[PDB]
Design a protein around this ligand. Sequence first.
Ligand SMILES: O=c1ccn([C@H]2C[C@H](O)[C@@H](COP(=O)(O)NP(=O)(O)OP(=O)(O)O)O2)c(=O)[nH]1
Ligand SMILES: O=c1ccn([C@H]2C[C@H](O)[C@@H](COP(=O)(O)NP(=O)(O)OP(=O)(O)O)O2)c(=O)[nH]1
Ligand SMILES: O=c1ccn([C@H]2C[C@H](O)[C@@H](COP(=O)(O)NP(=O)(O)OP(=O)(O)O)O2)c(=O)[nH]1
Ligand SMILES: [Mg+2]
Ligand SMILES: [Mg+2]
Ligand SMILES: [Mg+2]
Lengths: 155, 158, 153
Amino acid sequence: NTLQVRLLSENARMPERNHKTDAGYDIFSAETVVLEPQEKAVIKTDVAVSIPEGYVGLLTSRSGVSSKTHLVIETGKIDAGYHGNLGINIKNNAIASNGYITPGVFDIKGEIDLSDAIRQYGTYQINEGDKLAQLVIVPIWTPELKQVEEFESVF
Amino acid sequence: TNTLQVRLLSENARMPERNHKTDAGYDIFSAETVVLEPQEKAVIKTDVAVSIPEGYVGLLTSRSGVSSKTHLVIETGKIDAGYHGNLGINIKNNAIASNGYITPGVFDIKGEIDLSDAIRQYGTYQINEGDKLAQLVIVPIWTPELKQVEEFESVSER
Amino acid sequence: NTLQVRLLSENARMPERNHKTDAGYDIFSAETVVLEPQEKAVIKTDVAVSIPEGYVGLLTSRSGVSSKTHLVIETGKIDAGYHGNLGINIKNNAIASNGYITPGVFDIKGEIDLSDAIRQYGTYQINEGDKLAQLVIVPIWTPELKQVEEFES
Ligand SMILES: O=c1ccn([C@H]2C[C@H](O)[C@@H](COP(=O)(O)NP(=O)(O)OP(=O)(O)O)O2)c(=O)[nH]1
Ligand SMILES: O=c1ccn([C@H]2C[C@H](O)[C@@H](COP(=O)(O)NP(=O)(O)OP(=O)(O)O)O2)c(=O)[nH]1
Ligand SMILES: O=c1ccn([C@H]2C[C@H](O)[C@@H](COP(=O)(O)NP(=O)(O)OP(=O)(O)O)O2)c(=O)[nH]1
Ligand SMILES: [Mg+2]
Ligand SMILES: [Mg+2]
Ligand SMILES: [Mg+2]
C-alpha cells in the first residue's frame, strides 16, 4: 500500500518520513507568514493527500515547536474525501506586547532572527520550508448508528 | 460490528450524523443553549450516550471551521468503551477579557453576529441548542499487558 | 500482547489502566512542580515505554483536570523508537496575576492546599504522584508516499 501525494505549487514540499521508527510524516509550510501575539492563521502547505477510506489523518503539532514556543496548532482531522490543500490551523498564543517592539522575530525553534520591520515582541515568523507539523494516519471505525432505548452492555 | 448503539437522553438530544460516507467521524450537536463570555469554561451537554465496543476509543474533537473562525476551543475528549453516560463537549471561550466593552449582539459558532436579549461583553459566544459543535471519531486501540523491565528488548513490527 | 515499561526512578510509578475497559493508561508525575500563571513546563514521569513499530502513543489530558483547572496539556505523540523519559507538555493557562498573592496554591483537582510560600493567585502545584495524564495507544498506517501530478482511484 502507498499514499498518493500531490504538490499544488513550487513552494510545496514532499512530507518526509525520515526514520522507519517514526509514526508520522513531517509537514512543511509553503508560505512565509508573520504571526503577531494572539493572532490566528491557517498556514497553507500547498500539499494535497489522497487518504483511503477507512482512515483519518491527524495533522498535528510537533513536541519541540509546541514546548518551546507559543505557537499552538489545532490538530486537523483529514477525511478520505478531502483532496484539497492541507492547512495548518495555528495561533500565536503569546500575550500582547502592548507596545514593546524589537527589530527581531522568533522562529519555530524559539530563536531570534533579524526582521524587515520592527515588530511587536512575541511575534513569530513562520518561514517557507519550516518543519511545522506532522501527519499521523490512523485506521478508523465507521459503523452505522443504531438508536436504542437501552444498551446491551455494562468525568 | 458495522453498528454502533446510540442513546438519546432527552428531547433536546440529536442523533449524530455521518453526512458523507467519506467522512471519518460523526457530527455532534449541542443539546443546550449556552452563553459563554471571554475566558469562560463549560461542558456542553450533548444528551447523547454511545456504547463503544471494547478495543476502541472515541475522540470527541473539534471542527476545523469552528476552531479556525472563532475563539471557541474544544479539548479533545477521550471516550472510553463501556461509557454510557452523557457525552460532554469540553469547551472554553478563549477570547480576551473584553474589559468593559459591551455590544447588543453575540457571536455564533460560525463567527457571525446575532441580535441578543441582553447587552453582553464583546467576544461573547452563544452556543445554540442543536448547533454542530464537535465530531466523534472512533479509532481502534492497543491495550496490552504491562511488563516492568530493567532494560528494553527489541520488538517485532505490528 | 505485552508492552515493555521501564521505571527510571524511585519517584516513578507503573501506569495504570483504571477499569480495564478503559482505552488509556493513567500516567503519574514523578516530581513536584510549582507552576505560576502563563508558565510552561515539561513534567517528568520517569517512565519509559517501548511501543512497537506500527503504533503511536497519544500522551493526552484527563477530562477532569482539563475541565476543572487551567492546566493545559498538549497531546504528545510517542513514536516507536522513543525509549526515553515520557514528558508531559503542560502549561498553566491561568491569567497573569495583577500581583495578587495568597498563602495557598491550586491542585489538579481544583482545590486549594496550603503552600510554604505566598505565591501568585491562580498558581497550580503539581505533586509527585499526581494522576496527571493518560496514554492512549492506537495503530497507525505508515505507507510509502507516491507523488502524483493528479490523483487516481
Ligand atoms: O509530550 C511529549 C511529546 C513527545 N515526546 C517524545 C515522544 C517523541 O518521540 C519525541 C518528539 O517527537 P515529535 O515528532 O512529536 N517532535 P520533534 O519533531 O520536535 O522531535 P524530534 O526532533 O526528535 O523528531 O519526544 C514526549 O516524550 N512527550
Ligand atoms: O486544519 C485543518 C486543515 C484541513 N482540514 C481539512 C481536512 C478535512 O477533511 C476538511 C474538513 O474538516 P472538518 O470536518 O474539521 N471542518 P468542518 O467540520 O468545520 O466543515 P466541513 O466538514 O463541512 O468541511 O478540511 C482540516 O480538517 N483541518
Ligand atoms: O469531553 C469529554 C466528555 C466525556 N468524557 C467521558 C468519556 C470518558 O470515558 C469519561 C472519563 O474520561 P477521562 O478518563 O479522560 N477523564 P477522568 O480521568 O477525569 O475521569 P475518570 O476518573 O473516570 O477516568 O468521561 C470525556 O472523557 N471527555
Ligand atoms: Mg517529529
Ligand atoms: Mg466536518
Ligand atoms: Mg481517566
